[PDB]
Amino acid sequence: RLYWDDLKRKLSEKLDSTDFTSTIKLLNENSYVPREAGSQKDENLALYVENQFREFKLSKVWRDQHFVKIQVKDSAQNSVIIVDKNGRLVYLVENPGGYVAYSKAATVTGKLVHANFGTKKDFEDLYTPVNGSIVIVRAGKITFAEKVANAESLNAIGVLIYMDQTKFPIVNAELSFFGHAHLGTGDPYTPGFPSFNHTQFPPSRSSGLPNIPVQTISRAAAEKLFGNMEGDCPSDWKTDSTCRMVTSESKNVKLTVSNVLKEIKILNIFGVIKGFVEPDHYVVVGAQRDAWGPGAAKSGVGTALLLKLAQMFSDMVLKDGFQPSRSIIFASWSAGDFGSVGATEWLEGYLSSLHLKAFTYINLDKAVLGTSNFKVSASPLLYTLIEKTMQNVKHPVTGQFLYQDSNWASKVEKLTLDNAAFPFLAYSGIPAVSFCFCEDTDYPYLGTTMDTYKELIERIPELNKVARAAAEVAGQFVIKLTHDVELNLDYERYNSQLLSFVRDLNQYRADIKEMGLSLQWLYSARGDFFRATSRLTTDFGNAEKTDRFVMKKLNDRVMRVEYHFLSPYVSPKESPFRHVFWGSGSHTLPALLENLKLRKQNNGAFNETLFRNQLALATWTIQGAANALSGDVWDIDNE
Amino acid sequence: RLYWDDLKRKLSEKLDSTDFTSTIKLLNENSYVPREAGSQKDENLALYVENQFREFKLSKVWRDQHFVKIQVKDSAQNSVIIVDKNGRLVYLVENPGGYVAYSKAATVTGKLVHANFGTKKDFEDLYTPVNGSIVIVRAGKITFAEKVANAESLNAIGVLIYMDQTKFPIVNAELSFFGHAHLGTGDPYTPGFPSFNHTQFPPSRSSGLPNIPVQTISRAAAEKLFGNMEGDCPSDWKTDSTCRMVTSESKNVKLTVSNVLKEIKILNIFGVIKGFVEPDHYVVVGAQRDAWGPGAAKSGVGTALLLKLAQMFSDMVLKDGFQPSRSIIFASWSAGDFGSVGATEWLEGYLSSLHLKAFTYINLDKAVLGTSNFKVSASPLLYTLIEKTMQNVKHPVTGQFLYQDSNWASKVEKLTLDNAAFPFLAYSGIPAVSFCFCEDTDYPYLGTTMDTYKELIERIPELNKVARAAAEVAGQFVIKLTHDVELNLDYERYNSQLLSFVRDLNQYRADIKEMGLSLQWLYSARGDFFRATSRLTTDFGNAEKTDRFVMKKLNDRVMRVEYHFLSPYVSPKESPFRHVFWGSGSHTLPALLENLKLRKQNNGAFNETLFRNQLALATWTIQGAANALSGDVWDIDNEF
Amino acid sequence: DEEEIQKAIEELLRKGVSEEEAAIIIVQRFNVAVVVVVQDERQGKHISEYIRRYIPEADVILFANLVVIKVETHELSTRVWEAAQKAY
Amino acid sequence: DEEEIQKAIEELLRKGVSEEEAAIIIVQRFNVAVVVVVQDERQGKHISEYIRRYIPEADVILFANLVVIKVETHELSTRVWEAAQKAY
Numbered sequence A: 001r002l003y004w005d006d007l008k009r010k011l012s013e014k015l016d017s018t019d020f021t022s023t024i025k026l027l028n029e030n031s032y033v034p035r036e037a038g039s040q041k042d043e044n045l046a047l048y049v050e051n052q053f054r055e056f057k058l059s060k061v062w063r064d065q066h067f068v069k070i071q072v073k074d075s076a077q078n079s080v081i082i083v084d085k086n087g088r089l090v091y092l093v094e095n096p097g098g099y100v101a102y103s104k105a106a107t108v109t110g111k112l113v114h115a116n117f118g119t120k121k122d123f124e125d126l127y128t129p130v131n132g133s134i135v136i137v138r139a140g141k142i143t144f145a146e147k148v149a150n151a152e153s154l155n156a157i158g159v160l161i162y163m164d165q166t167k168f169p170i171v172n173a174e175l176s177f178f179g180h181a182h183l184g185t186g187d188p189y190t191p192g193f194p195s196f197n198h199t200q201f202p203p204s205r206s207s208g209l210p211n212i213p214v215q216t217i218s219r220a221a222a223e224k225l226f227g228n229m230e231g232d233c234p235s236d237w238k239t240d241s242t243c244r245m246v247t248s249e250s251k252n253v254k255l256t257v258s259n260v261l262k263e264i265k266i267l268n269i270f271g272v273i274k275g276f277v278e279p280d281h282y283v284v285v286g287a288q289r290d291a292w293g294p295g296a297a298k299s300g301v302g303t304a305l306l307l308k309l310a311q312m313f314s315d316m317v318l319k320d321g322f323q324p325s326r327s328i329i330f331a332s333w334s335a336g337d338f339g340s341v342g343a344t345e346w347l348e349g350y351l352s353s354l355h356l357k358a359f360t361y362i363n364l365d366k367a368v369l370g371t372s373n374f375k376v377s378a379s380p381l382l383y384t385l386i387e388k389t390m391q392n393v394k395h396p397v398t399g400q401f402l403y404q405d406s407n408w409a410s411k412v413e414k415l416t417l418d419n420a421a422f423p424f425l426a427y428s429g430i431p432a433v434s435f436c437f438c439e440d441t442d443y444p445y446l447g448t449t450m451d452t453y454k455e456l457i458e459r460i461p462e463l464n465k466v467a468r469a470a471a472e473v474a475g476q477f478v479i480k481l482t483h484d485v486e487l488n489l490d491y492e493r494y495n496s497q498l499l500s501f502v503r504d505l506n507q508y509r510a511d512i513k514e515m516g517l518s519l520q521w522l523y524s525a526r527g528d529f530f531r532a533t534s535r536l537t538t539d540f541g542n543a544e545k546t547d548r549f550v551m552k553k554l555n556d557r558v559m560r561v562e563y564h565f566l567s568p569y570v571s572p573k574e575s576p577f578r579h580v581f582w583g584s585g586s587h588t589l590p591a592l593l594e595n596l597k598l599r600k601q602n603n604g605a606f607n608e609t610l611f612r613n614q615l616a617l618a619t620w621t622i623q624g625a626a627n628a629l630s631g632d633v634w635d636i637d638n639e
Numbered sequence B: 001r002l003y004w005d006d007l008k009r010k011l012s013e014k015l016d017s018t019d020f021t022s023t024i025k026l027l028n029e030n031s032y033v034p035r036e037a038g039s040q041k042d043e044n045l046a047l048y049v050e051n052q053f054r055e056f057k058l059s060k061v062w063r064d065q066h067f068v069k070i071q072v073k074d075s076a077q078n079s080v081i082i083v084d085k086n087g088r089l090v091y092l093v094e095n096p097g098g099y100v101a102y103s104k105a106a107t108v109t110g111k112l113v114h115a116n117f118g119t120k121k122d123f124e125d126l127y128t129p130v131n132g133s134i135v136i137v138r139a140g141k142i143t144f145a146e147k148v149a150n151a152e153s154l155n156a157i158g159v160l161i162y163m164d165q166t167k168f169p170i171v172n173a174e175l176s177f178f179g180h181a182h183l184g185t186g187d188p189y190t191p192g193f194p195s196f197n198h199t200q201f202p203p204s205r206s207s208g209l210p211n212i213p214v215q216t217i218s219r220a221a222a223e224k225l226f227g228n229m230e231g232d233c234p235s236d237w238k239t240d241s242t243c244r245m246v247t248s249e250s251k252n253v254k255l256t257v258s259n260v261l262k263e264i265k266i267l268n269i270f271g272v273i274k275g276f277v278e279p280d281h282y283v284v285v286g287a288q289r290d291a292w293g294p295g296a297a298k299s300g301v302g303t304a305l306l307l308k309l310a311q312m313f314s315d316m317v318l319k320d321g322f323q324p325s326r327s328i329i330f331a332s333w334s335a336g337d338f339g340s341v342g343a344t345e346w347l348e349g350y351l352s353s354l355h356l357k358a359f360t361y362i363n364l365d366k367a368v369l370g371t372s373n374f375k376v377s378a379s380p381l382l383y384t385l386i387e388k389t390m391q392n393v394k395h396p397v398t399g400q401f402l403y404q405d406s407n408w409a410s411k412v413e414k415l416t417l418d419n420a421a422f423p424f425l426a427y428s429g430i431p432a433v434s435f436c437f438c439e440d441t442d443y444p445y446l447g448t449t450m451d452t453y454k455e456l457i458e459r460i461p462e463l464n465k466v467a468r469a470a471a472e473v474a475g476q477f478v479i480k481l482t483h484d485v486e487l488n489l490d491y492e493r494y495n496s497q498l499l500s501f502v503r504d505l506n507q508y509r510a511d512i513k514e515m516g517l518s519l520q521w522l523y524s525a526r527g528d529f530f531r532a533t534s535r536l537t538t539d540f541g542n543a544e545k546t547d548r549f550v551m552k553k554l555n556d557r558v559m560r561v562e563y564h565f566l567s568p569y570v571s572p573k574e575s576p577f578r579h580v581f582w583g584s585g586s587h588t589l590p591a592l593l594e595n596l597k598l599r600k601q602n603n604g605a606f607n608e609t610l611f612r613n614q615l616a617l618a619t620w621t622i623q624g625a626a627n628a629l630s631g632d633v634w635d636i637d638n639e640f
Numbered sequence C, D: 001d002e003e004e005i006q007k008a009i010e011e012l013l014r015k016g017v018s019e020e021e022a023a024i025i026i027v028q029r030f031n032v033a034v035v036v037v038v039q040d041e042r043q044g045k046h047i048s049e050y051i052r053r054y055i056p057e058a059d060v061i062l063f064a065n066l067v068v069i070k071v072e073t074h075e076l077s078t079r080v081w082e083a084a085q086k087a088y
């Protein structure tokens, strides 16, 4: 029999004998490039991954076939033009090679106002209003969809996105790039339900689709526009010197976007290594396969890591006697640049089949972007698992352990809309984890035509060792979640997550006292959840691990923790991100805090009735999670 | 060790040694007779039930306190008046004693049009339009809430409900009665969430609340109104000869309702006998305790059956060595005639704790209303069980087995809004069952002050043996749901259900092809569900019943069948009855069929966009249930 | 208790309440059987004597063009209503 | 081609399209650098000769009070744009 100390050294020894640069630059050949969603080369790479899964002698390989509507450029060229002197002077700024998917096809003419990164606080700290004008924004900080939503909320008629040289130091300055403006995930025309032929594709439009045109432009076109506008950009923004603010008096900008929808067939490839004790429970390891350009950083590294992890685990189970108690699923997704279309539609299709079976998701997308920092975003249940993993995995260049900051958990940022783990965590209620070796600045070539293998190996010479470290982190994650009778999910991690929330809410106690309300029941629910976690820990400690009955009874209560945080009072179709902690909508705790923060201004932006309903529903969501983790229904106490 | 054949006749021997009429007429003593929801005598009866549960030495006895808003009469009397000659002739018709809770407090004046029972077909087959007029209807067929909703949908300004002598043969022509008109369950001011102090009771109103006044009147007042009306009521209604249709041209009716809201504290009493093998899984046996009047037929019989079943099962566990594998929960609810307030609020409060633990609910309300027929409304998963209980339980009077019709399953009516098992089945996805020894006519004294023990023992002389037979049915249900390693839940039954649905849908093939759609994927979904049921049956057959882990895993696969039929695309707060088969809303299969009907009519009623989304979500709901029942996600082998 | 009904009718008529809604308020407050609004007091006396002749068990009182008839049974209530309809 | 642009402008101007939106359509369809709508042919000659004097690398064509200037680099495009702004 093998224990953790042997599995770890076996995984490390197999990692030392594996080359990742070869597989990456093979995925960067002239077969497979470029691989847009639904393209022929994406299908070729899907078939290659499927046949490689077959070669690894996995327990079972299969495929899912979806038909989704994406958006592409039309025969008519998108245009950015400058008009002057009441339309008697026209100036072609750019015919961009890139575009923003799911943008509304229209033409709009008006003034161009700069809004920095397009965040809500950026629009708040602006003197020039953007109502009925086009907005120029630089990329970064938030997703394209968030920028377009924040602009459209203030009656902006158009959005232009560029890359400044200060945050994106690119020599070319005429490079085009690609993104999507859908404020959500999955096929925006099958919102909440899968994209299969069974649905017969009824008329359904996601509310996350924008109703204003958004277009990407190069830095050359951005500076060309800057040459026709006035006002110095604030030094707080840290942008180029050529930056300007608002167009001239008589100068207007005309933006013409003519993108068209296209129905395509995407393929999700899957392999599974069945468990030896509890095969019905499993971890899912996914990676995006498609990419607008070459996509070496985002999709190539992830797909190579997926292939090599599958190969190594199959070799361990077939030749080295590794016997996981629970199953392992390796998934190659498609259409990952229009949101998380493949993964989200797969979740929406088989949601009832993986309800309380799939218990962890590990995303491998964009895992190698630098060598300075090791960043991670995950559900609290995995925090400890991450911590114990950072204490015994060495840095690729410095040679030291990844665990250096003892307060890393207090600095973890939550998953964002562009990450494929976000629909796994906020929609399906499955704990998900994404990690990356990156830098303090964004990878400049993401979404561009220069996201190639040569530009990636030149920026990262030790790419093999960094990819090996990322694969080692992922492999230790997989082993810790499958090899032992105890699942390494730390429920107590949520206690602090609750303890902060109420405390934040307590900072507005006076408001709570002015509306005749009280926070005592939220404190009661938090304490009940804390005591339930403590009782569960003590029962785990007092139970014999060889008794399968009691162990499964406890693990079922462990695997229900993340599900009980999904809001049971909202529609999963019109509000799929149901998680009260990491979701999106008025049902989340951050939304409750946002609403309550508006009362003291006394302007009519605070909705008290909405706030009371939010308080009630969130309080009882926390209390129901606590009562479900407590145990049987007849062991709950009342006043 | 004990087997089923021993437990059967031991339960029977305890049934023969149990007296039910004693406890019934004890619950009908002046210490408890008028137990309105939240009253003092309701609280005393709850205390008596709790002390009796403690005396039986159950595994645990506890209680839940809810604070809910009901509606009660005001100091000002509700009035029905007739005015004529431009208000120069005033005629007092009635100051009724009963009322309809959750009615809108208002005063309306206008014409009075008879609409039979107030069903949608009654309003459709009507010559006189009811828009802007008051509607008088007869009690029966549907609930009060359905009548008021169907009236308000056609712009009716008021509703009057009475009891005709043909349908309700009562001598007292001035007897009052009580009802409620909330199109839903639970506290209508905490819709979708429990009625606890933790919620702090935010301003939220259920959409099922009516916006027109509705008042109950006696037969004398109804005939007095008919004396001022014209037109003979159609012979298809089978009503009294004094029935009339429409008031005179110059005569109008004034209805004044002034009911007021009242916040009350309701108590739900619970006892639990813990299991010996799988104590975390359990069935729930409930019974309404409160009533507007004496409530001997509705709540008294149910509470007596609950007490006696608890006592007998506790005796079998403590004295006869009966070891249930799974737990048993006996529940006495409150506020059971204002909807299903107690049980619905309990479900909304502890839904996360009963997700995949509570696997069957057995309702005891109104189980003894007659001796002629034995009626049953339940989820198909219990059908087989019910059948297996009708083949070895004898009739209290005829002495023959209850299983006489071999095609009873094709004649089963679905649970209705007034039944307490409806929120258990349609909202929480728990298989539920309701049964009753009744007659072909409704019990006339339900909801009246004449629902006493004397009238019940006069109408049913052998009340003791009929109550014993009902308790035997419930006890056999519990025993076959608790004693063995198999739950005796027949999933294959749902196959038949699906086979019905698609069949009806085939009747509209010409329309489906006319919209450019196809039914092949729904055919494939039905076939895949059949295949999944067959695979689960073979897995049960090939697994050895002594392996508790594999058996519990298969039973976990079984306990997810009813849950996977809850629509995952609607809001459980604003559409709680999510069950696509037995729920309510545009997400159900009957709603899909009713909407598709209008395709042939070619008028504006058919919403093609809605139908396309309905067909898509319903098709994948069935396909998702089949894929989940098949097994693991990687073992789904079907042509996609 | 005829004179309290009379006081109520008088005080309601002085507040600006018309005769018809005053009759409605009277039948709502005192639970009387029938109220008749007449044009003059000769017709009032005529209708009151008619009701007294054909329903002698009824209590009939006349005040300010309002005829209030009170009975305690439903047969006599319907008889009073029909007599008021016929003699109106 | 000069003749192609001339025929397109002719067909568009005869159709009822105004000069400004016609210039917008021209720059959308032919990928030209700058287009200037002038009041008369005097301004046309002036601006055309000015742009050809200060930017000899530009391809300038005049037709129906519309001066279309086509260049193939961004610096020369900015030069042509500034010259057209100054000469207008």
Ligand SMILES: *[C@@H]1O[C@H](CO)[C@@H](O[C@@H]2O[C@H](CO)[C@@H](O[C@@H]3O[C@H](CO[C@H]4O[C@H](CO)[C@@H](O)[C@H](O)[C@@H]4O)[C@@H](O)[C@H](O[C@H]4O[C@H](CO)[C@@H](O)[C@H](O)[C@@H]4O)[C@@H]3O)[C@H](O)[C@H]2NC(C)=O)[C@H](O)[C@H]1NC(C)=O
Pocket: A639, B067, B197, B263, B264, B265
């Ligand atoms: C959870 O939520 C429920 C529903 O909102 C709350 O229940 C209400 O709680 C309030 C506050 O305790 C109750 O109001 C108080 O009720 C007392 C009950 O006394 C009864 O008996 C006396 C005779 O002995 C009667 O006169 C009285 O009408 C009652 O029938 C009253 O005694 C209280 O009056 C005193 O306090 C008030 C101010 O609170 C003063 O104005 C009075 O002069 C007097 O000093 C008061 O009326 C209310 O009745 C409860 N409703 C129900 C339906 O139970 C729960 O309190 C809440 N729980 C928690 C923990 O917050």
Ligand SMILES: *[C@@H]1O[C@H](CO)[C@@H](O[C@@H]2O[C@H](CO)[C@@H](O[C@@H]3O[C@H](CO)[C@@H](O)[C@H](O)[C@@H]3O)[C@H](O)[C@H]2NC(C)=O)[C@H](O)[C@H]1NC(C)=O
Pocket: A067, A197, A263, A264, A265, B640
């Ligand atoms: C499931 O739905 C998808 C999408 O609706 C179907 O794919 C589509 O199938 C049709 C008919 O087979 C294709 O149309 C045909 O295209 C060819 C050109 O390749 C043309 O010559 C024909 O006249 C016809 O128009 C359509 O291209 C295709 N779309 C995609 C994106 O592949 C699929 O067939 C459906 N599957 C089943 C089993 O119904």
Ligand SMILES: *[C@@H]1O[C@H](CO)[C@@H](O[C@@H]2O[C@H](CO)[C@@H](O)[C@H](O)[C@H]2NC(C)=O)[C@H](O)[C@H]1NC(C)=O
Pocket: A129, A131, A132, A133
């Ligand atoms: C953006 O909003 C402002 C609102 O002030 C508009 O400015 C004008 O403001 C005056 C008030 O001093 C109003 O009387 C005018 O009606 C406003 N103009 C219009 C067109 O509504 C400003 O015009 C708005 N900009 C756009 C593009 O709509």
Ligand SMILES: *[C@@H]1O[C@H](CO)[C@@H](O[C@@H]2O[C@H](CO)[C@@H](O)[C@H](O)[C@H]2NC(C)=O)[C@H](O)[C@H]1NC(C)=O
Pocket: A607, A609, A610
């Ligand atoms: C405050 O929030 C409530 C609830 O979100 C809003 O009430 C809804 O308003 C819309 C449009 O007015 C209606 O269609 C809904 O039916 C309302 N919901 C109800 C009644 O439950 C309310 O409009 C918000 N107020 C403001 C000023 O934004």
Ligand SMILES: *[C@@H]1O[C@H](CO)[C@@H](O[C@@H]2O[C@H](CO)[C@@H](O)[C@H](O)[C@H]2NC(C)=O)[C@H](O)[C@H]1NC(C)=O
Pocket: B129, B131, B132, B133
């Ligand atoms: C019920 O609805 C009908 C139809 O709308 C009403 O009858 C019409 O009333 C309008 C006045 O609003 C007249 O102009 C039409 O001539 C009427 N049509 C017919 C066929 O008579 C009717 O008044 C409504 N009833 C009530 C009580 O409001």
Ligand SMILES: *[C@@H]1O[C@H](CO)[C@@H](O[C@@H]2O[C@H](CO)[C@@H](O)[C@H](O)[C@H]2NC(C)=O)[C@H](O)[C@H]1NC(C)=O
Pocket: B607, B609, B610
């Ligand atoms: C037909 O059904 C559709 C879908 O249920 C209805 O569309 C809704 O319309 C309201 C009113 O504008 C919107 O608030 C909803 O968001 C729409 N939902 C969808 C899914 O589109 C439509 O109104 C119905 N039409 C009729 C005549 O009943």
Ligand SMILES: [Ca+2]
Pocket: A185, A186, A187, A188, A189, A190, A191, A192, A193, A344
């Ligand atoms: Ca979607």
Ligand SMILES: [Ca+2]
Pocket: B185, B186, B187, B188, B189, B190, B191, B192, B193, B344, B345
């Ligand atoms: Ca409720």
